[PDB]
Write a protein that binds this DNA or RNA. Structure first.
Ligand code: ZN
Lengths: 116, 225, 333, 421, 50
RNA sequence: UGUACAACGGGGUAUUGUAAGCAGUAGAGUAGCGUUACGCUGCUGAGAUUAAGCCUUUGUUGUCUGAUUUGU
RNA sequence: GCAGUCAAGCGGCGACAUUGCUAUCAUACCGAAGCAGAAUUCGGUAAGCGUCUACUGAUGAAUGUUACCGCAAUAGUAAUUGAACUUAGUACGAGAGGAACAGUUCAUUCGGAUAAUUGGUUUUUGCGGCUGUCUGAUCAGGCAUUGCCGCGAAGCUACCAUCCGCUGGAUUAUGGCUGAACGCCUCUAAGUCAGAAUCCAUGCUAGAACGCGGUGAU
RNA sequence: AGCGAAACCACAGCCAAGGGAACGGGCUUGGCAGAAUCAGCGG
């Protein structure tokens, strides 16, 4: 199984949920929830709304692009399998998540500046 | 030398299999006869592993490559990417192609020295083929055919192309591709020769329904003897 | 349509009565013929198809899976049966002198107003030095050829808002009925683990009263080939962590089950849907036969279970994933 | 149809066909009626019964007629061939008689239906139906001889080795039991012998063979010495697009001496010369040399056991009919001996192993040790492939600890820097 | 739409001879698995799979 | 008269798409004589929905006998 | 129907044959065809499935009382067709051609249910904006016995979504053994093997509301 | 909540067969099945 990304919410989506549409252009389009699919059918861009991940992360309301968010990305070439190398993924992903946990809070606090 | 077989009694060998000089790709299922046919002549000197591509049985049309490397379609799941590297030795490169149409058996058809690509193929993989495959790349719609890869098969011994190829074109391809070709038909006169045949420098596989003259012509052009 | 389920008359009791049972086992020891539980709900399962000759061999397959709550069954008595021209007859019955409150309450409808002075004359007699009690066991052993064991659900462990339990008579097939009665007595007041009754890939069948469409439904039903995917334990953390994904989580959907409490006890996953609905008792049996076929011989390859919330839509599987992706909010730091 | 017939429906004898039609009309149609029922209902009942019987008879007759091929319009060669196997005039007369009987049955059924539409009494309708059925049976019953002849013709024609005249064919002619009987068997698969009696080959055997990747076939003449068999053989040799060959024997086979054989051979002069004749022979020299007067022929002495001579003659006949950069290979693959199914020590294919153990496709696919992995100690995998809502495949890379080391200190850098003010 | 074994839905008159060959050499369109896989002959005559 | 019935608050849960207010002076605005009819910023994935048939319960608190017939 | 070699009886008629036009369509244990093989039709068997009375949902005291559990006489009863893998490119067959039993893989058909996703489903009377109504007005959308744009779980709910849908005997026709009758013969009259999709057993449904049994309470 | 009719009523209903013009509903041979009591297939 492979987790894909929705073009509307720009977030991962599990299989067997929402609705999936494939255009004649020979590529797949996914939607986490039926509301996203309906909005995409109406051509309503969410990237200008305060709630969507794309707007929040880029503007400052949420964590922006950072070195931590540079590993969960698809790759074009395969990797040689190794049982020992599997353990590295478990530790590496956990450490990356722990590192990121200390950056989202910092970004939110920076956004909160001036609330005093 | 040449072998006649079928997958599910279907003559579309080129759709359910993709045989190369360094690896063998065939469909999957309980019917091991198709895999056994390749295993017999090929034996064990080269890896013979049946695997799925994008979950479909059209692995033959879905994948393409040569001795230097292997190419797989865009829809190839990341799970199959691990299998691709595990089965093939590290000496053979593996690269995924982001084609417009998810079928390498239609966009790319090549051999150990020359490759034919769709006119609208991505420039990235088009240039990378010169290293992954080590072959020359030419955008050429044979006789105007949009599906270049599904109507021809190529190898260092030559190949069989759709009947629309003129004899003069076949003779010129002896120098344009460094290997002469022959115009013929497979699957009892089917114009789509590449769909029903898979053949390499030392082994040829064709549909059972293929007529004897077609098999003899295929053997002669590939100079097996 | 089908006249076998007509008239459309409601069943007599919510609990589904079990009619048939296997015949006998000449060599194997005493074993439980059936198991019972409660329907926790339904979710989704994805695995890899190892079934031979399949068109989707080694390809992902998705199908609905029901989750059944199966708390450790406890034995509280044994019933002896004797063959008669009129059929099986329960000539004698015996208890264990330590019936739980869950069972004693079932013997009342106004437990609050009841004096609760039940199982006293017999329990006091049972408290004697065996001699009197052993006579019934000897009589059962002398004549009886089929023995049934009374069992009830540990409702206290389940999150249901019910204290009264239910008594179900479960048959045994082990030979030398003396061994059967000896085993039953040795297990009085004891519990039996779920794994000891059923195992993975077993082609068990279940019977339960269907949902009442309201007089449509509410009748007893049966369906064979209710294959169990994976048996889980409440104490064994990471039950929802499949063999492949092994994600640290539990099968309980986020925010609990729809109109049902969170699952925190032993549970079993069964392929496909099942009769009844949430908050309904169900029974499990081995279909009385063996479905010899490659469908049964295959093995489970579970990869992921749908554990998203059922209130509205769902974007996350576990709370640990939500906070990372969603980040903080007004109600947080 | 083509020049081959094996789908002709069986010709039911008049009695058998009549019984079948009677059973069909009795069973399918209703059989319970009373005088107290509606008069219109009884009229409809009788009309339906009569119409069903007539339609069944007509359909059976049409099906019988359509199955048989039209001898006249099939082909002149096949027409002449059938003219000797069966009496062509009798065949046409029988077909015409059957067609006329079918037309008469149709007319009778239509007339009875028209008359029955205005019946006045139930017994009148019953009598009309009885008369119609009796007339149909009587007309059908008289077809016993033509129906028997049609059945015999169908049986005889259902197995003939007929072939298209345009196909390359070889014709062998000669006296009975000359020795050419073994010729066809050697050239093509057939069951014939050189038993020392004249007509060891009564039928016109046909057999296929291949040469120079081109299809060919040969035909053996039953015997030529008017004779019915001789006429039938001639009416196929003359019209077939084939090469006619002659055979001879000295004193043992064929009975007749060389002079008689030469005299018989000269009798086929008017028409045999146009088919590139050749002669094989199983004071006498002059008689044999007399064949040279033909515009072109080849004569060679041989024997029934001279298989190489037969092969050379076949090759010569086929020739006469016809006249009218360097690759790169993984040498390791080709070094291994080619597959030898008969060798018990060969590299048994997965098919054989599965059949021995896994049986048919019921076996399950496995990839144990299939991967070209370095260490076999860990040839078993349970891939996580998903963790914390993220795909493990995006993190599985060789020794990512080196990259993680550069990010480890970023936590301390952020903590002491104080982004949280 | 229709359910796929992969775990996600999918959605977007012609006749052929008994061999499934269409009257064209440059067929194009939404040739899903229902035709790209069911009809291997058509899949070779069709470029845009899925 | 007890890991007992219960009521809110809170959390879990997703949903809508960013509430009323300070007040745009973040910003060109321009009819005058920079002004003023008027020209998405901090709370704010915000407010609310968030079971009269979604889950809980770190739980304090409000509660706990009104009638009945039958018995080898 | 007309005339007749027509002739068992028989008061001059007369069933018998011949001479002139005019309770299955597939689902097959079984046999025949000039059935090499597939296919085919015929006699074969079965209607199994294909092609004011009546309750369809219901209530009430019973057999010391109460509560639990259990047996079953009874009535009903259900799965199913096609396509591929395979023995298969085979037995066979002059060549082209193209079977099956044993095990698997898919969908329509009929039935029992589940909501894992989606929707025809919305009174969360739920939400951001919005119109008539027009709000002292920036507050406020104060109103459409039921509002619009964008959404919505749940109740509902269907391949418009999902899972599932039996294993042993007795027999009809039929193929044999022994064995006569009728010193022979034979399948049958004594018995018996194989064998029906038929019948009964297996299972499921409800359970005599006066069919029954066991247990805690006085 | 309370008031309050009418049509119709020799008496009226568990079925299969015989019952002559067949009307079977009260004659004969057999099989059914609960005092009391909601609600109806599109009869
Ligand atoms: Zn999203």
């Amino acid at each position: 199984m492979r987790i894909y990304q929705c073009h509307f919410c720009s977030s991962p989506c599990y299989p067997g949920h929402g609705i999936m549409f494939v255009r004649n252009d020979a590529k797949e389009f996914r939607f986490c929830r039926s509301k996203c699919h309906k909005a995409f059918k109406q051509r309503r861009n969410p990237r200008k709304l305060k709630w969507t991940k794309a707007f929040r992360k880029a503007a400052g309301k949420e964590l922006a692009v950072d070195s931590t968010l540079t590993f969960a990305q698809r790759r074009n070439v395969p990797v040689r399998y190794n049982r020992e190398l599997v353990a590295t993924t478990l530790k590496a992903m956990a450490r990356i998540e722990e590192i990121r946990q200390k950056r989202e809070r910092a970004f939110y606090k920076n956004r909160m500046r001036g609330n005093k | 030398m040449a072998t006649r077989t079928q997958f599910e009694n279907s003559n579309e060998i080129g759709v359910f299999s993709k045989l190369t000089n360094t690896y063998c790709l065939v469909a999957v299922g309980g019917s091991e006869n198709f895999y056994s046919a390749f295993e017999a002549e090929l034996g064990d000197a080269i890896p013979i592993v049946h695997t799925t591509i994008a979950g479909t049985r059209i692995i033959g049309r879905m994948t393409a490559g040569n001795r230097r490397g292997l190419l797989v379609p865009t829809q190839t799941t990341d799970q199959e990417l691990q299998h691709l590297r595990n089965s093939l030795p590290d000496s053979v490169k593996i690269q995924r192609v982001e084609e417009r149409l998810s079928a390498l058996g239609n966009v790319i058809c090549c051999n150990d020295y020359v490759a034919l690509v769709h006119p609208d193929i991505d420039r990235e993989t088009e240039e990378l083929i010169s290293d992954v495959l080590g072959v020359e790349v030419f955008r050429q719609t044979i006789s105007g055919n949009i599906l270049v890869g599904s109507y021809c098969s190529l190898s260092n011994q030559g190949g069989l192309v759709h009947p629309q190829t003129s004899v003069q074109d076949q003779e010129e391809l002896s120098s344009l591709l460094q290997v002469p070709l022959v115009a013929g038909t497979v699957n009892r006169g089917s114009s789509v020769v590449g769909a029903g045949m898979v053949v390499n420098d030392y082994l040829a596989v064709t549909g059972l329904d293929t007529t004897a003259p077609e098999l003899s012509v295929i053997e002669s052009i590939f100079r097996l003897q | 349509g089908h006249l076998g389920f007509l008239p459309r008359k409601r069943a007599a009791s919510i609990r589904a009565r079990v009619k048939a049972f296997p015949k006998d086992d000449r060599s194997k020891p005493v074993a439980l013929t059936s198991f019972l539980g409660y329907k926790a709900g339904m979710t989704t399962i994805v695995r890899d198809l190892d079934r031979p000759g399949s068109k989707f061999h080694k390809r992902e397959v998705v199908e609905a899976v029901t989750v059944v709550d199966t708390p450790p069954v406890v034995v509280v008595g044994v019933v002896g049966y004797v063959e008669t021209p009129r059929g099986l007859r329960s000539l004698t019955t015996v208890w264990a002198e330590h019936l739980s409150d869950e069972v004693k309450r079932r013997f009342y409808k106004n437990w609050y107003k009841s004096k609760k002075k039940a199982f006293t004359k017999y329990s006091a007699k049972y408290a004697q030095d065996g001699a009197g009690i052993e006579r019934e066991l000897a009589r059962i052993k002398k004549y009886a050829s089929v023995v049934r064991v009374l069992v009830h659900t540990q409702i206290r462990k389940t999150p249901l808002a019910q204290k009264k339990a239910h008594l179900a008579e479960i048959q045994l097939n082990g030979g030398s009925i003396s061994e059967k009665v000896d085993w039953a007595r040795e297990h009085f007041e004891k519990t039996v683990a779920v794994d000891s009754v059923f195992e993975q890939n077993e082609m068990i069948d279940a019977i339960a009263v269907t949902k009442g469409h309201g007089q449509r439904g509410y009748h007893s039903r049966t369906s064979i080939n209710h294959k169990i995917y994976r048996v889980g334990k409440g104490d064994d953390e990471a039950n929802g962590a499949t063999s492949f994904d092994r994600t640290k989580k539990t099968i309980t959907p986020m925010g609990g089950f729809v109109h049902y409490g969170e699952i925190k006890n032993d549970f079993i996953m069964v392929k496909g849907c099942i009769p009844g609905n949430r908050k309904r008792i169900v029974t499990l049996r081995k279909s009385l036969y063996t479905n010899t076929s490659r469908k049964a011989l295959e093995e489970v390859s579970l990869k992921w279970i749908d554990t998203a919330s059922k209130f509205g839509k769902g974007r996350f599987q576990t709370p640990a994933e939500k906070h990372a992706f969603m980040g903080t909010l007004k109600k947080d730091l | 149809m083509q020049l081959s017939w094996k789908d002709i429906p069986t010709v039911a004898p008049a009695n058998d066909l009549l019984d079948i039609v009677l059973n069909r009309t009795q069973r399918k149609t209703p059989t319970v009626i009373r005088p107290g029922f509606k008069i219109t209902r009884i009229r409809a009942f009788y009309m339906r019964k009569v119409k069903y019987t007539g339609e069944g008879f007509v359909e059976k007759f049409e099906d019988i007629l359509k199955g048989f091929p039209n001898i006249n319009d099939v082909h002149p060669f096949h027409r002449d061939l059938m003219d000797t196997l069966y009496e062509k005039n009798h065949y046409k007369i029988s077909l015409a008689a059957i067609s006329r009987a079918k037309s008469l049955v149709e007319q009778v059924a239509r007339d009875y239906v028209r008359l029955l539409k205005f019946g006045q009494s139930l017994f009148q309708c019953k009598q009309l139906k009885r008369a119609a059925l009796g007339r149909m049976a009587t007309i059908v019953k008289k077809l016993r001889d033509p129906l028997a002849y049609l059945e015999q013709v169908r049986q005889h024609i259902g197995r003939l080795p007929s072939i298209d005249p345009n196909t390359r064919t070889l014709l062998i002619c000669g006296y009975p039991n000359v020795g050419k009987s073994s010729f066809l068997r050697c050239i093509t698969k057939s069951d014939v012998d050189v038993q020392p009696y004249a007509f060891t080959t009564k039928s016109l055997y046909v057999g296929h063979f291949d040469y120079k990747y081109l299809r060919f076939q040969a035909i053996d003449t039953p015997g030529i010495l008017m004779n019915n068999i001789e006429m039938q053989s001639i009416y196929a040799i003359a019209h077939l697009r084939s090469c006619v060959l002659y055979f001879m024997d000295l004193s043992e086979q064929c009975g007749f001496t060389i002079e008689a054989q030469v005299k018989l051979f000269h009798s086929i002069k008017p028409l045999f010369a146009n088919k590139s004749v050749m002669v094989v022979i199983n004071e006498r020299a002059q008689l044999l040399e007399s064949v040279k007067e033909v515009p072109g022929v080849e004569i060679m002495t041989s024997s029934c056991q001279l298989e190489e001579n037969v092969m050379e003659v076949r090759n010569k006949a086929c020739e006469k009919l016809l006249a009218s950069r360097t690759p790169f290979i993984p040498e390791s693959v080709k070094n291994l001996k080619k597959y030898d199914p008969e060798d018990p020590n060969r590299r048994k294919l997965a098919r054989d192993i599965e059949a021995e153990n896994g049986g048919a496709g019921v076996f399950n696919v496995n990839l144990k040790d299939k991967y070209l992995l370095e260490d076999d100690e860990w040839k078993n995998d349970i891939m996580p492939e998903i963790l914390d809502g993220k795909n493990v495949y995006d993190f599985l890379d060789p020794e990512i600890a080196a990259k993680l080391q550069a990010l480890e200190e970023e936590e301390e850098k952020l903590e002491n820097e104080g982004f949280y003010n | 739409s229709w359910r796929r074994r992969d775990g996600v839905f999918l959605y977007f008159g012609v006749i052929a001879n008994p061999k499934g060959e269409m009257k064209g050499s440059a067929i194009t369109g939404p040739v899903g698995k229902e035709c790209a896989d069911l009809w291997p002959r058509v899949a070779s005559n069709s470029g845009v799979v899925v």
